[PDB]
Amino acid sequence: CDAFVGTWKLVSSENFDDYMKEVGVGFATRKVAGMAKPNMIISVNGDLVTIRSESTFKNTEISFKLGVEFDEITADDRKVKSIITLDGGALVQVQKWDGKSTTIKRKRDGDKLVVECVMKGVTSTRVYERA
């Protein structure tokens, strides 16, 4: 929560095409999504956190309370169920859709925000810096 509020800009990506191929995203969608260089805006108002991502591909926004299940439809049109929790100062997100599952973890490292995306052993790392 307060370590994260602010505005952030993507600075590097590693293995995002292979992670997206594992999640099941189609050729054309992986191509235009892998070119995007997003800006993430995170805020807290009492009990509620909001994460907004703004991009040349799609703009996205989710609002939630920690530990409580919600519906989300992702930038690539998968309709899923998610839960977000804090573990040792990291936010962990689990997305579930028809027998599948992924985890997206966000933690601070120095002045950076690090996001690790995992689907069956394939891991992708994206690093953001304060804009």
Residue 76 near residue 25 (C-beta atoms within 8 A): yes
One-letter amino acid identity for 87?
D
Nearest partner of 57 among 27, 80, 41, 34, judged by Cα: 34
* Residue 67 CB partners (closer than 8 Å, separation 6+): 83, 84, 85
Could you tell me the two tokens for 129?
Answer: 């810096």
Q: Supply the range of the domain harboring residue 37.
A: 1-131
CATH code of the domain covering residue 3: 2.40.128.20
According to the annotation, is 19 in a ligand binding site? no
Neighbours of 45 (CB within 10 A): 8
Question: H/E/C letters for each residue in the chain?
Answer: CCCCCEEEEEEEEECHHHHHHHHCCCHHHHHHHHHCCCEEEEEEECCEEEEEEECCCCCEEEEECCCCCEEEECCCCCEEEEEEEEECCEEEEEEEECCEEEEEEEEEECCEEEEEEEECCEEEEEEEEEC
The tokens of 122 are what?
């394939």
Instruction: Please report the resolution in angstroms.
Output: 2.5
Distances (CA, A) of 68 to 47, 84, 93, 115, 128: 12, 7, 11, 21, 26
Amino acid code (one letter) for 73: I
What is the domain count for the chain?
1
Is 128 annotated in a binding site? The answer is yes
What was the structure determination method?
X-ray
For residue 25, give both structure tokens.
Answer: 């995203």
Measured CA to CA, the distance from residue 120 to residue 35 in angstroms comes to: 24
Residue 98's identity, in one-letter code, is D
Q: Are 12 and 109 in contact (CB under 8 A)?
A: no
State yes or no: 126 annotated in a binding site: yes
- Of 90, 30, 112, nearest to 104 by C-alpha is 90
